[PDB]
Design a protein around this ligand. Structure first.
Ligand SMILES: *[C@@H]1O[C@H](CO)[C@@H](O[C@@H]2O[C@H](CO)[C@@H](O[C@@H]3O[C@H](CO)[C@@H](O)[C@H](O[C@H]4O[C@H](CO)[C@@H](O)[C@H](O)[C@@H]4O)[C@@H]3O)[C@H](O)[C@H]2NC(C)=O)[C@H](O)[C@H]1NC(C)=O
Ligand SMILES: *[C@@H]1O[C@H](CO)[C@@H](O[C@@H]2O[C@H](CO)[C@@H](O[C@@H]3O[C@H](CO)[C@@H](O)[C@H](O)[C@@H]3O)[C@H](O)[C@H]2NC(C)=O)[C@H](O)[C@H]1NC(C)=O
Ligand SMILES: *[C@@H]1O[C@H](CO[C@@H]2O[C@@H](C)[C@@H](O)[C@@H](O)[C@@H]2O)[C@@H](O[C@@H]2O[C@H](CO)[C@@H](O)[C@H](O)[C@H]2NC(C)=O)[C@H](O)[C@H]1NC(C)=O
Ligand SMILES: *[C@@H]1O[C@H](CO[C@@H]2O[C@@H](C)[C@@H](O)[C@@H](O)[C@@H]2O)[C@@H](O[C@@H]2O[C@H](CO)[C@@H](O)[C@H](O)[C@H]2NC(C)=O)[C@H](O)[C@H]1NC(C)=O
Ligand SMILES: *[C@@H]1O[C@H](CO)[C@@H](O[C@@H]2O[C@H](CO)[C@@H](O)[C@H](O)[C@H]2NC(C)=O)[C@H](O)[C@H]1NC(C)=O
Ligand code: NOJ
Ligand code: CL
Ligand code: CL
Ligand code: CL
Ligand code: CL
Ligand code: CL
Ligand code: CL
Length: 846
């Protein structure tokens, strides 16, 4: 009975230190580790739930689950209902609920055979999910007891391999460690460091299977939770409330698993085109004069900049929806001037609203009070905490009235200063004191029977009381949604205020966040370590459907070095959201603040990103319509190559662009994995060893300080556009194609183009979509949709990679071209043309 292999021992004392006598008294097994692995663990006979009265419907199955012997937690729910819904051929969904009481549930909008089968174990109860094609066991919850008590749910399963990713937000490799790892989801203001619960919580994992298939599991639960991985391999979800609401996505391809998950939580929002330009911010641009100098200094040194930002500096006494009348006296004019020059403007907004001002002197508070928009305490008054302005109340973004008040405050402020989006910070919600000015009461919500492994050892640490009252429920249940709900409210407020696509960047997030907003990784240090860690983290958020993500370029905390900021600017130009931001006391790190050689390297990075923007935009369109990733790990694209599975210091843009950054000081080369195929050096494409032929292998590449390695996959065509210091300017330039031929002379690509900012483009059909095809020494376009928005897009240059012999002639629509060049050393054919993306063309060579 207690002969259980070390790796398959499930912890029977997750709640407290326990003795042998206590362990045995719980009906558990005690065997000390020989050197984490639990000493007290469940025998196979440990009391669980029993399945009874299983029956079948057109939807799937239902059953009753009965527990006969209490667990060691209080308030077991002894009778539960199981509902199994076979929703699509790829998506299985099950719930375990209390049929006698509605429990808190996370608010969320809703040959022929499924890819899965489902079977059940009777006693102990478990759900077993097989992949039909190959019989692989994906889920098996029979491996450990089911616990379902009022403030403790535990459901375990075997995992199909040692390879699992997800469960943000944490500073870790992309592939998680199964060595007795405890992963805590409880949104928390803490600078990213390993082993800690950070700003967001996403209870989703993707698990790889031998051979390259995969599946995903989403537990729709917003309570504080630990997820415990052990090396058998196996996983335990351990939540402090709610219900078990479980989705399994069958893939089989990892990219399909992601798309299937996003079908449930929502596809990424389409950003405005300008949102993909460079953003520049710091805490400490303390006047409009200083802030204007940033744009002047960037422009004078030919650095592109689309969006100027301010941090707290603009506010009056650090309060939302104000600006001070000293340094920021002419804030409205500064923002109007930015617009006049073709740029946008972003500023920080915090959730907490100053509560200490004289009554009638501060409308956001006074109106909020009147309308009842704030989270309240035991006696029904606003919970008062401490943040930047001093004493503050906290908006309740589950209250419809608070949504309307937030819309009003944003619209009214926008009438004074026409900002183009919102940077929403401190929205965990972050509290400078514990719980509230008045502490928190003593009850089961503040002092629950199981506290997950949160920093500080309490749910109140750095945040508000858990038993505080919100419209939908207590904060205990809703905490992990605070940021998300604020992002939803801000998205709507911005739609209404501006009438064009919203641009929201948020610190705190929950599953489904990407449908409304983007994210940045928070207070990362200016260190080589954090530069390298940013790659897995950006990739992780793309797997979670938040493709508009990045880290603060050159780092936020501490002082960057020139070498670090070159390498960080190089890699960060491939963050889908690219912003350089800096803390109050740090040395300056704007691109123009460095030496000439460093400036040149930074300028090159920005120039290439701007050249790539039509392609990046199209990748975002694919994310938005099809649930694709924008930045993706090599394993998502080449999952049948098992050597890609642990690679997270390289990244792909889409299917075709491989970026291999230097991430260490003092390096002049880099070793990266190249999947099977031909990879062309993108430096061989004129922007205003030529080819790696890989069998699937590691390659060491020259990488001097001035360089980042970027390779284009054979078989693909990338649209490019001419230069500008803003997207307003760049969007008017002539376009180009980079055509990467296979050995057989084949390539394919696409362009999506719309006006860059309007709402409801796809629904109204107000966009142009063109496909490009290379075949048999010709290049053509295919006009999928041509509208007024794609009119007059001028194609003036076509660059072909992998042309093995010099051509004797090159034709564009049947006429010999004005001029072309061919380099026998690089196999590159560069062709000058006068064509239009929206009109059928044929280019050929022989
Ligand atoms: C729910 O939130 C509300 C706020 O929305 C919160 O109200 C706060 O209550 C405390 C008392 O519990 C108030 O503090 C008092 O303020 C007055 C004057 O400003 C003082 O005279 C009081 O002093 C007493 O307590 C001292 C202890 O150090 C004694 O030394 C002294 O002799 C007095 O007996 C006391 O500081 C506080 O001002 C309000 N906040 C606001 C904004 O009005 C309420 O407590 C919350 N409810 C729960 C259950 O937490
Ligand atoms: C899902 O997980 C459950 C629990 O781990 C698995 O069921 C267990 O399977 C083991 C090994 O096959 C069983 O132990 C064996 O029992 C037989 C018969 O007594 C004996 O001949 C062996 O010596 C061994 O002890 C165990 O009884 C069984 N547990 C339960 C509760 O049924 C199960 O196989 C997994 N399911 C799938 C499809 O992988
Ligand atoms: C499992 O179900 C039986 C029978 O349930 C009946 O048939 C179902 C299809 C549905 O129509 C139910 O409403 C019916 O009651 C349960 O056993 C019955 O229990 C009731 C009340 O305790 C009793 O009056 C009946 O005589 C019982 N009938 C039989 C055939 O035993 C049983 O309790 C269910 N088990 C669990 C764990 O819930
Ligand atoms: C980040 O650097 C600041 C400033 O550093 C100074 O100026 C630089 C140009 C360079 O010459 C440095 O060597 C200088 O020290 C540091 O802030 C200074 O801290 C020291 C001692 O802690 C203090 O005496 C100075 O007055 C500070 N100067 C300023 C301008 O604030 C800061 O400590 C560095 N930050 C970290 C985290 O190391
Ligand atoms: C923009 O650039 C100007 C010029 O490079 C900076 O102004 C200089 O600031 C230094 C302080 O380090 C002074 O010693 C110089 O006298 C200034 N020169 C000139 C010509 O004004 C300015 O600091 C930069 N502003 C920002 C926001 O980066
Ligand atoms: O607003 C001040 C400070 N708060 C915390 C944010 O993470 C950081 O970016 C910002 O500069
Ligand atoms: Cl002991
Ligand atoms: Cl509730
Ligand atoms: Cl553990
Ligand atoms: Cl399959
Ligand atoms: Cl390898
Ligand atoms: Cl032409």
């Amino acid at each position: 009975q207690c002969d259980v292999p070390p790796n398959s021992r499930f912890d029977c004392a997750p709640d407290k230190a326990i003795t042998q006598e206590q362990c045995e008294a719980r009906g558990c097994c005690y065997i000390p580790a020989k050197q984490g692995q639990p000493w007290c663990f469940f025998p196979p006979s440990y009391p669980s739930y029993k399945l009874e009265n299983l029956s079948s419907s057109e939807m799937g199955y239902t059953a009753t689950l009965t527990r006969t012997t209490p667990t060691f937690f209080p308030k077991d729910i002894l009778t539960l209902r199981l509902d199994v819904m076979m929703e699509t051929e790829n998506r299985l969904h099950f719930t375990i609920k209390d049929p006698a009481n509605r429990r808190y549930e996370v608010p969320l909008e809703t040959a022929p055979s499924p890819l899965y089968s489902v079977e059940f174990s009777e006693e102990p109860f478990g759900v077993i999910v097989h992949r039909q094609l190959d019989g692989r066991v994906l889920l098996n919850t029979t491996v450990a007891p089911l616990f379902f008590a009022d403030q403790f749910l535990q459901l375990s399963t075997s995992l199909p391999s040692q390879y699992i990713t997800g469960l943000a937000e944490h500073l870790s490799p992309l592939m998680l460690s199964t060595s007795w790892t405890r992963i805590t989801l409880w949104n928390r203001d803490l600078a990213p460091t390993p082993g800690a619960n950070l700003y967001g919580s996403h209870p989703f994992y993707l698990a790889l299977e031998d051979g390259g298939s995969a599946h995903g599991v989403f537990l729709l639960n917003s309570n504080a939770m630990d997820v415990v991985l052990q090396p058998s391999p196996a996983l335990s979800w351990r939540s402090t409330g709610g219900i078990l609401d479980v989705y399994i996505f069958l893939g089989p391809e990892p990219k399909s698993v992601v798309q299937q998950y996003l079908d449930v939580v929502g596809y990424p929002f389409m950003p405005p085109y300008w949102g993909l330009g460079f953003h520049l911010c710091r805490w400490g641009y303390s006047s409009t004069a200083i802030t204007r100098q940033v744009v002047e200094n960037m422009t004078r040194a030919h650095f592109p900049l689309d969006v100027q930002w301010n941090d707290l500096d603009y506010m009056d006494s650090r309060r939302d929806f104000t600006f001070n009348k000293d340094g920021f006296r002419d804030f409205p004019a500064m923002v109007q001037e930015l617009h006049q020059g073709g740029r946008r403007y972003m500023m920080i907004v915090d959730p907490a609203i100053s509560s200490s001002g004289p009554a009638g002197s501060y409308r956001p508070y006074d109106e909020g009070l009147r309308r009842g928009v704030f989270i309240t305490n035991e006696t029904g008054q606003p919970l008062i905490g401490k943040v930047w302005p001093g004493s503050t109340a906290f908006p309740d973004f589950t209250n419809p009235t608070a949504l309307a008040w937030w819309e009003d405050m944003v619209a009214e402020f926008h009438d004074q200063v026409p900002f183009d989006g919102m940077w929403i910070d401190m929205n965990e919600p972050s509290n400078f004191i514990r719980g509230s000015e008045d502490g928190c009461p003593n009850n089961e919500l503040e002092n629950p029977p199981y506290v997950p492994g949160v920093v500080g050892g309490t749910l109140q640490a750095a945040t508000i009381c858990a038993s505080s009252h919100q419209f939908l429920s207590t904060h205990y249940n809703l905490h992990n949604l605070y940021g998300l709900t604020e992002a939803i409210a801000s998205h709507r407020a911005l739609v209404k205020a501006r009438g064009t696509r919203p641009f929201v960047i948020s610190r705190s997030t929950f599953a489904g966040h990407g449908r409304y907003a983007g994210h940045w990784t928070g207070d990362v240090w200016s260190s080589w370590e954090q530069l390298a860690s940013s790659v897995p983290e950006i990739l992780q958020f793309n797997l979670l459907g938040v493709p508009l993500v990045g880290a603060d370029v050159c780092g936020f905390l501490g002082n960057t070095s020139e070498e670090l900021c070159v390498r960080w600017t190089q890699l960060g130009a491939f963050y889908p959201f690219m912003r350089n931001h800096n803390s109050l006391l740090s040395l300056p790190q704007e691109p123009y603040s460095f030496s000439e050689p460093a400036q040149q390297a930074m300028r090159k990075a920005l120039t290439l990103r701007y050249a790539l923007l039509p392609h990046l935009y199209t990748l975002f369109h694919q994310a938005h319509v099809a649930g694709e990733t924008v930045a993706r790990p090599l394993f998502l694209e080449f999952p049948k190559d098992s050597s890609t599975w642990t690679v997270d210091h390289q990244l792909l843009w889409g299917e075709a662009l491989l970026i291999t950054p230097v991430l260490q000081a003092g390096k002049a080369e880099v070793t990266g994995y190249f999947p099977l195929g031909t990879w062309y050096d993108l430096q061989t494409v004129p922007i205003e060893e030529p080819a790696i032929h890989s069998e699937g292998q590691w390659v060491t590449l020259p990488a001097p300080l001035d360089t980042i390695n970027v390779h284009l996959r054979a078989g693909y065509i990338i649209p490019l556009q001419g230069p500008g210091l803003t997207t307003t300017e760049s969007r008017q330039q002539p376009m180009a194609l980079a055509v990467a031929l296979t050995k057989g002379g084949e390539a394919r690509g696409e362009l999506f183009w719309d006006d860059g900012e309007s709402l409801e483009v796809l629904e109204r059909g107000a966009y142009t979509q063109v496909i490009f095809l290379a075949r048999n020494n010709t290049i053509v376009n295919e006009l999928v949709r041509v509208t007024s928005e794609g009119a007059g897009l001028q194609l003036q240059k076509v660059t072909v990679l992998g042309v093995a012999t010099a051509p004797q002639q090159v034709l564009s629509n049947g006429v010999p071209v004005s001029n072309f060049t061919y380099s026998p050393d690089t196999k590159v054919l560069d062709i000058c043309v006068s064509l239009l993306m929206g009109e059928q063309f044929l280019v050929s060579w022989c």
